[PDB]
Amino acid sequence: VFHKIRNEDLIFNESLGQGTFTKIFKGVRREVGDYGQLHETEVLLKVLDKAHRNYSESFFEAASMMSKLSHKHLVLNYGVCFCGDENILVQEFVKFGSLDTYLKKNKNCINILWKLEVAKQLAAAMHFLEENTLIHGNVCAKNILLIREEDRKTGNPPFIKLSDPGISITVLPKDILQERIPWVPPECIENPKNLNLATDKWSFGTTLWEICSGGDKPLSALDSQRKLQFYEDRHQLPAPKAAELANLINNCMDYEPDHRPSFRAIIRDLNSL
Ligand SMILES: O=C(Nc1c[nH]nc1-c1nc2cc(CN3CCOCC3)ccc2[nH]1)NC1CC1
């Protein structure tokens, strides 16, 4: 599965900032629907950096994976454009953007039932991938996207969706993998080729730390080299100020790779609170 979209059917509107070796843009895809009616659609346009064109293989292996999947809490991928010289991904556009900047903007206005439901939606998608023995590899708060904000008056919850895996950590330089600590599991630092279903659970715990602290970045004050010793010393994550979900964060972030519980178990612990 690898749909192709013509460059003449994609318009580029506003930029949305840089990213992990990519550049983000809002745009419109003009497609022809039934009865001969053109059907414009707001889309997300993820352009790979031309300077890093060597990562085009994993850049497209990420799109081929998400185009095969249909889940409520997964960002849909419409296709791929070879728009001129650049390689571009076309995805479902979410209105409210990244979750990490949403937690930081409304840090004191986010109830704990809000964070609990968001964690349920994220754990739902991770259970779907685990059920279908699929590995994500880049589960972080910056990749989580909010399509609907909380509306207690209507009774509908907030709605989050996880984006594409992006560039796999197996092909990233050792310089860049150490700077991703503690999102990269400890076993992947000593051996980048140890990608596993258990590696996502570690990132799920690190992401649960982000939402529980309100957008704060763990180990941000530490440089790349001190992060490397953080793992060798077997240090655990300092519990956030709220200190609610911190008990579950420690279980998901266990240094033994096979001790990480399944997401069917995690879904139970979130409903038991
Ligand atoms: O895949 C990603 N994002 C998206 C996939 N589909 N749609 C998006 C996306 N959509 C975005 C939309 C905005 C617009 N603002 C959001 C909050 O403040 C008001 C408007 C900003 C960034 C956005 N990213 N990665 C994120 C950029 C690093």
Q: 97 CA distance to ligand 1 centroid (A)?
A: 3
- Give CA–CA dist 245/116, Å, rounded: 9
- Give CA–CA dist 97/215, Å, rounded: 14
- Cβ(16) to ligand 1 under 6 A? yes
SS3 78: strand
- Give CA–CA dist 24/22, Å, rounded: 7
- Cβ(27) to ligand 1 under 6 A? no
Q: 270 CA distance to ligand 1 centroid (A)?
A: 27
Structural domains of the chain, with CATH: 1-93 (3.30.200.20), 94-273 (1.10.510.10)
Determined by X-ray
* 214 φψ region: left (φ > 0), alpha (ψ -120 to 50), beta (else): left
DSSP 87-115: -EEEEEPPSS-BHHHHHHHTGGG--HHHH
- Cβ(246) to ligand 1 under 6 A? no
**Cis omega (within 30 of 0) on the bond before 158?**
no
Sheet holding 10-18, edge to edge: 10-18, 22-32, 38-48, 88-92, 77-81
Q: Which residue is closest in CA terms to ligand 1's atom 10?
A: 97
- Give CA–CA dist 89/19, Å, rounded: 13
206 within 8 A of 182, measured Cβ to Cβ = yes
The half-sphere exposure of 128 on its side-chain side, counting CA atoms within 13 A, is 16
Q: Resolution, in Å, please? A: 3.2
Q: Nearest-CA neighbor of 162 among 103, 75, 100? A: 75
Helix then strand then coil, % of the chain, to nearest 5: 40, 20, 40
Q: Are strands 38-48 and 159-162 parallel, antiparallel or unpaired?
A: unpaired
- Hey, which residues does 4 pair with through a beta bridge? 80
